[PDB]
Amino acid sequence: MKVILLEPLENLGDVGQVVDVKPGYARNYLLPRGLAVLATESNLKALEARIRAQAKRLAERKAEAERLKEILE
RNA sequence: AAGGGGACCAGCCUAAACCGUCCGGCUUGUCCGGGCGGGGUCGUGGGGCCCUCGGACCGAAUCCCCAGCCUAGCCGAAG
Ligand SMILES: [Mg+2]
Ligand SMILES: [Mg+2]
Ligand SMILES: [Mg+2]
Ligand SMILES: [Mg+2]
Ligand SMILES: [Mg+2]
Ligand SMILES: [Mg+2]
Ligand SMILES: [Mg+2]
Ligand SMILES: [Mg+2]
Ligand SMILES: [Mg+2]
Ligand SMILES: [Mg+2]
Ligand SMILES: [Mg+2]
């Protein structure tokens, strides 16, 4: 089963990285502890939504710093 | 079993594309989920979004009234 890696763990990957593991391991170990959530059609919209929200903040921050860069010097 | 001949007819509501409304989750959102309204119900596919042109008659399976009907009866010829 596909899941999203909530907390960065060892020998698995990056925080937020999608990883497919044996479902029983996640049903007995990962999900009850709140360390993982399986990848649905909705949390893809929510993961694209938070990544694109960090991008909506980033594109504002760096562009404002570049406009102020055009103001200074 | 198909079919033919008869009895009888009546076709519809939703899930979901779409919008709106509130809700509450914290993970702060063009986020998700859960409610309600609207929008929708197709097979020579059909609808949703975008735009173009065009813009009364049907009709309940629900309701009301009216004919009609059963739960008593009545008249009813002449030794
Ligand atoms: Mg590994
Ligand atoms: Mg705890
Ligand atoms: Mg810098
Ligand atoms: Mg300087
Ligand atoms: Mg057969
Ligand atoms: Mg037949
Ligand atoms: Mg009805
Ligand atoms: Mg009559
Ligand atoms: Mg009669
Ligand atoms: Mg009577
Ligand atoms: Mg007489």
H or E, element range at A57: helix A43-71
Strands A18-20, A36-38: pairing kind: unpaired
Residues 7-46 of A with CB under 7 A from strand B: 41-43, 45-46
Task: Determine the 3-state secondary structure of A4 from DSSP.
Answer: strand
For ligand 3, the distance from its centroid to the CA atom of residue A65, given in whole angstroms, is: 8
φ, ψ at A65 (rounded to 5°):
-65, -30
Phi (first) and psi of residue A39, to 5 degrees: -85, 115
Q: Which nucleotide is nearest to A48 (CA to C1')?
A: B31
Place of tokens 């929510």: A46
Q: According to the entry, how was the structure determined?
A: X-ray
- Listing DSSP states for A6-56 in one string gives -S--TTT--TT-EEE--HHHIIIIIGGGTSEEE--SSHHHHHHHHHHHHHH
- Distance, CA A26 to ligand 7 centroid (Å)? 49
H-helix or E-strand spanning residue A67: helix A43-71
Give Dmax (Cα) for chain A.
60
Structure tokens at A38: 């399986």
